[PDB]
Amino acid sequence: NSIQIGGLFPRGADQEYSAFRVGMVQFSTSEFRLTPHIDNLEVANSFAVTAAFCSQFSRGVYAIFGFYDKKSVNTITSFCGTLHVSFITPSFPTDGTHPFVIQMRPDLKGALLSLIEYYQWDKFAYLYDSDRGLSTLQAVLDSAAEKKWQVTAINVGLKKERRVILDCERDKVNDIVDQVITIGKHVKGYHYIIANLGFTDGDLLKIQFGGANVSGFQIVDYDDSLVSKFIERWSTLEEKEYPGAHTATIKYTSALTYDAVQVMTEAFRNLRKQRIEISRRGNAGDCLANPAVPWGQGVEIERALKQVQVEGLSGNIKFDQNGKRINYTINIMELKTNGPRKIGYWSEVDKMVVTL
Amino acid sequence: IQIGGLFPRGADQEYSAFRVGMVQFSTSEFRLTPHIDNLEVANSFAVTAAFCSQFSRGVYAIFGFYDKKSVNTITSFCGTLHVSFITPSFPTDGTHPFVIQMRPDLKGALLSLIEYYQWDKFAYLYDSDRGLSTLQAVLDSAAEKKWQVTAINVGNINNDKKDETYRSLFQDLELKKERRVILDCERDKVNDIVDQVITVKGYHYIIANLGFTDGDLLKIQFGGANVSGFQIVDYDDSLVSKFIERWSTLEEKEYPGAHTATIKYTSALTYDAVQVMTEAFRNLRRGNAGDCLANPAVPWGQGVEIERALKQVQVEGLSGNIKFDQNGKRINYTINIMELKTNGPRKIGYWSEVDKMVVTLT
């Protein structure tokens, strides 16, 4: 049988969509075929997100892979929770209890706080925007209170501070660093921490940091044989057929998208073994129906997704009962004179930066 | 003229004020016809459905509330469907069309008041359930102003992080000896949190809300601490006195939250919103939520005429001078600066949106 699934992609997310399509070929199985219904939209627009979500719902999809942002996250969590439709996402994780939301992206706050402590900072700037929520801001301020740190926290969305965390969209990093350089004051005297999971993604390291210290994080480890094999294939794909591919690296969001296909596939295999109906007809049903009478299979589908344990591009994939990644590792990177290098790792279980 | 009215469960006094406004501002020549629904504002699905049902009915505007979880539903649906939403809720950071914000921004007055007292080291007790936008404005300014801010989330008070909180508080209040403290929370949580802090005479609290005198002001007690805050409803205005003279005798069962000598600022703003809609709309069955997806948006050219009519209103209300900029933000208003004195709360000065500084009264 075929299993209907939805896809809600941001406009311009081409590599992500390519990774999605690569995933569907790679994890295809004789047991069933995934029939995706793909939409492209501005995910910052909660109305458009609602329309796309309801369109999928009326098609009777068994789960939706997609993206949200700060402006639409509440629409997703609320609609998923109401209608019992599972949403599997590489977007920023939330701390709220959110049933029916499967968050592929590991939380970064714990590793970031451990890294600050590892470098023994007690005074620094936290330059951020809200595009990935404000849980990291709160975590930094909470720890500053408890640890007696002096933090300057400025929303970027004549001072002798030299330690700087950048938790902002990739564009703003260049603008910020550029100012530092050209002020000449101790340019090599700075230490930047880049608070994202893609230290070696895109053009970040194309920035001229002028000999400053630069640290960051990475969830995709190119020393993994699993990752090495994937990149071998990925880098040889036809870019006209797979826009964003044919590259030597893959953005962490694209990696999580490919990983998401494996997780969904494993969940459906498990449901199939339990003889739970995952292909059904029929009728569209009404999204803003009253009462909201949610789907019975939804609870089992949600359960199956959260019970998945697999190894993927993003390492060990396992979730807690609230759809949050657990038991993962975040690689700690530094820009050494020869290039970016792993200096250690942070494990969700231990919650300590481990050197080497 | 049909309008929607979307009220959170428990906004009883606000609904009374709305009803009282309907009567006070009604005209033989013209009457608003409201369709009232009571909703869980923290639930974006429920907010979407209520908004869309009003859209379906064909209303000229929707009066209502949102919170940090549903504000994006409101701005997006307002902007897409071209239906004006008028609200007493927190004013948005960004600019968004088709939204009329009755509530004046507090950030500027708060920053000016911190400067006024010449603070340079203080605790900031915020709650993430309320939102962080005011906290952010303060943190942004701390850089330029040489401020040392210790920020603690008094949210998560019964929740998982309960432990870290009282630790931070203990460290700050007992160990660091902070003494200067801003409380950024719901007006009815002030009491609950101050008692926490007490468990001293030399403390100085700033209550970061627009309703200083709305709630408890003893002796609550603050234990001889200084207490300062903000008030947009001036009970010495003859407009406000007259309203209160009338409101104080309304029967409490018929008008929940009435028969009081004061009115919550959100209820004041709700009454003011009725005056605003009435002024704007002069001279210019059931609802199916599915219509949000089945029907096209109101043509922009039509919706915008209503939006502009609302934004152009200039009137005097319970909340003082009411005027809006092109983004629906209150401008040219005044916030009174209050301090709790031994004989009760007193107006010690004001902060005008035009000049943006705390001015001292004799």
Ligand SMILES: *[C@@H]1O[C@H](CO)[C@@H](O)[C@H](O)[C@H]1NC(C)=O
């Ligand atoms: C940067 O890294 C160097 C090398 O260990 C260290 O000595 C320095 O203190 C770090 N911090 C800054 C701000 O440079």
Ligand SMILES: *[C@@H]1O[C@H](CO)[C@@H](O)[C@H](O)[C@H]1NC(C)=O
């Ligand atoms: C508000 O005050 C400013 C500054 O005095 C004034 O110039 C402006 O005209 C006022 N705005 C309106 C809409 O009256």
